[PDB]
Design a protein around this ligand. Structure first.
Ligand SMILES: *[C@@H]1O[C@H](CO)[C@@H](O[C@@H]2O[C@H](CO)[C@@H](O[C@@H]3O[C@H](CO[C@H]4O[C@H](CO)[C@@H](O)[C@H](O)[C@@H]4O)[C@@H](O)[C@H](O[C@H]4O[C@H](CO)[C@@H](O)[C@H](O)[C@@H]4O)[C@@H]3O)[C@H](O)[C@H]2NC(C)=O)[C@H](O)[C@H]1NC(C)=O
Ligand SMILES: CC(=O)N[C@H]1[C@H]([C@H](O)[C@H](O)COC(C)=O)O[C@@](O[C@H](CO)[C@@H](O)[C@@H]2O[C@@](O)(C(=O)O)C[C@H](O)[C@H]2NC(C)=O)(C(=O)O)C[C@@H]1O
Ligand SMILES: *[C@@H]1O[C@H](CO)[C@@H](O[C@@H]2O[C@H](CO)[C@@H](O[C@@H]3O[C@H](CO)[C@@H](O)[C@H](O)[C@@H]3O)[C@H](O)[C@H]2NC(C)=O)[C@H](O)[C@H]1NC(C)=O
Ligand SMILES: *[C@@H]1O[C@H](CO)[C@@H](O[C@@H]2O[C@H](CO)[C@@H](O)[C@H](O)[C@H]2NC(C)=O)[C@H](O)[C@H]1NC(C)=O
Ligand SMILES: *[C@@H]1O[C@H](CO)[C@@H](O[C@@H]2O[C@H](CO)[C@@H](O)[C@H](O)[C@H]2NC(C)=O)[C@H](O)[C@H]1NC(C)=O
Ligand SMILES: *[C@@H]1O[C@H](CO)[C@@H](O[C@@H]2O[C@H](CO)[C@@H](O)[C@H](O)[C@H]2NC(C)=O)[C@H](O)[C@H]1NC(C)=O
Ligand SMILES: *[C@@H]1O[C@H](CO)[C@@H](O)[C@H](O)[C@H]1NC(C)=O
Ligand SMILES: *[C@@H]1O[C@H](CO)[C@@H](O)[C@H](O)[C@H]1NC(C)=O
Ligand SMILES: *[C@@H]1O[C@H](CO)[C@@H](O)[C@H](O)[C@H]1NC(C)=O
Length: 268
């Protein structure tokens, strides 16, 4: 389970759907994937050695996205999907572009980052709403079996990842826009000295700082929420979710900046 609040028992089973395991892909930073822009500094036409929170090059990404239709598996809410956060994670996220009457809609998996996921602790939640990235850090009463829905194509079940009938205490609540037309989003989520840090990019690969948040406590787990949809499958549209994650660690990188200050290349 993620939280311990019984939000529902509608269409839950124990099936091991990942007979083909958690999908894998290899980290390659040679074109600036896994890197970020440094503070308020601009470097031009140069190579820098910098120590930052970065992927290990040649490590695996795990695809933790979980598309459902009606049923949820209890095994989706356990290890290996419920994951240790440690120093942080780098995410490579597919923007699943769906269409209704030729209007484009953007979907991708929510990530929750926390410790015990109980309403006596703060859970950071990062959720897309078709070009708005809603980010909150609140004392959420997380469900046992949290998930999101396609609001675009609909779903055979209602959205429930928390059950707070009155608004919970929040340390953070902001909306960041993102370009609904891009194929990929990139995120760094990391912690240092009881402060959480987020970086993202919706365009290019090197991420830029979104926000930081003092928590005063260690984050220990993260979980990519299942998304339930009547679309996003081979029998209906051949679309897919992908939410690739890999661990961060404190690493020295070479970073190369072009004559317009973009990180074009890196070495671990
Ligand atoms: C912070 O988060 C915690 C969870 O970590 C929340 O605590 C839980 O809150 C719920 C709701 O109050 C507790 O609900 C339990 O419901 C059982 C019956 O459920 C069915 O029936 C009701 C209608 O009667 C429906 O609403 C419901 O949907 C179900 O269909 C009761 O049997 C439970 O009773 C407990 O206490 C009695 C003694 O008083 C014992 O006899 C029982 O055996 C049982 O132990 C209870 O009412 C749930 O138990 C809570 N869990 C914990 C760990 O406390 C907090 O509500 C939340 N706080 C805030 C501010 O959001
Ligand atoms: C994490 C994972 O494994 N994700 C896959 C999912 C699950 O394995 C399955 O949900 C688990 O189920 C449990 C826990 O019991 O299966 C999907 O594929 C299905 C066939 O496997 C799909 O074709 C569905 O087939 C139906 O027969 C049915 O109900 O499953 C009719 C339904 O209308 C149709 N869905 C549509 C139209 O999207 C899906 O989507 O659900 C593709 C997802 O990538
Ligand atoms: C950040 O972005 C999210 C997503 O767009 C915003 O949440 C949405 O805010 C609107 C306006 O408050 C909500 O609509 C209202 O909902 C109530 C309850 O159903 C209804 O009575 C009102 O008439 C109105 O429809 C909407 O429900 C809410 N959630 C979603 C998923 O859309 C949020 O307000 C933005 N701002 C901040 C500071 O977070
Ligand atoms: C979780 O909550 C659900 C309700 O959302 C509980 O399901 C009900 O259980 C009682 C047991 O007497 C039945 O009479 C009802 O028919 C059930 N369904 C509904 C819709 O109320 C469920 O028991 C709870 N606990 C667990 C472990 O799932
Ligand atoms: C970016 O920096 C490089 C390295 O200093 C510059 O490349 C040199 O350019 C001169 C002509 O201006 C050539 O004679 C050298 O042979 C080049 N060296 C290399 C290693 O290519 C480059 O001009 C700079 N560009 C900008 C726009 O600043
Ligand atoms: C939103 O994202 C799309 C897709 O990456 C951007 O479209 C590209 O725009 C450049 C010019 O800026 C063109 O050279 C490319 O050919 C476009 N690609 C496609 C697939 O159309 C778009 O510019 C972005 N818009 C904003 C405001 O960020
Ligand atoms: C699910 O099935 C695969 C293939 O047999 C296996 O490797 C994996 O350990 C199973 N997972 C669980 C939770 O049993
Ligand atoms: C979804 O919510 C509506 C409104 O409360 C309800 O009528 C419907 O039965 C719910 N369906 C499920 C599967 O929870
Ligand atoms: C999905 O792709 C496969 C392979 O190209 C094809 O056989 C199938 O008809 C496609 N289905 C849909 C709904 O596009």
């Amino acid at each position: 389970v993620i939280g311990d609040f019984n939000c529902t028992n509608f269409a839950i089973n124990d099936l091991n759907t990942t007979v083909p395991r958690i999908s894998e892909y290899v980290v390659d930073v040679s074109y600036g994937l896994g890197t970020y822009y440094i503070l308020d500094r601009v470097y031009l036409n140069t190579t820098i050695l910098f120590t930052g929170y970065f992927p290990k090059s040649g490590a695996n990404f795990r695809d933790l996205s979980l598309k459902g239709t009606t049923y949820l598996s209890t095994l989706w809410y356990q290890k290996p999907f419920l994951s240790d956060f440690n120093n942080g994670i780098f995410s490579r996220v597919k923007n699943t572009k769906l269409y209704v009457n030729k209007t484009l809609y953007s979907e991708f998996s929510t990530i929750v980052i926390g410790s015990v996921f109980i309403n006596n602790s703060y859970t950071i939640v990062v959720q897309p709403h078709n070009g708005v990235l809603e980010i909150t850090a609140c004392q959420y009463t997380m469900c046992e079996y949290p998930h999101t829905i396609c609001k675009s194509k609909g779903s055979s079940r209602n959205e429930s990842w928390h059950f707070d009938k009155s608004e919970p205490l929040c340390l953070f609540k902001k909306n960041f826009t993102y370009n609904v037309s891009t194929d990929w989003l990139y995120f760094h989520f990391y912690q240092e000295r009881g402060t959480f840090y987020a970086y993202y990019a919706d365009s290019g690969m090197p991420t830029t700082f979104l926000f930081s948040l003092y928590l005063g406590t260690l984050l220990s787990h993260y979980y990519v929420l299942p998304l339930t949809c009547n679309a996003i499958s081979s029998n209906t549209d051949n679309e897919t979710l992908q939410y690739w994650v890999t661990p961060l660690s404190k690493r020295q990188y070479l970073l190369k900046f072009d004559n317009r200050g973009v990180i074009t290349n890196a070495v671990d």
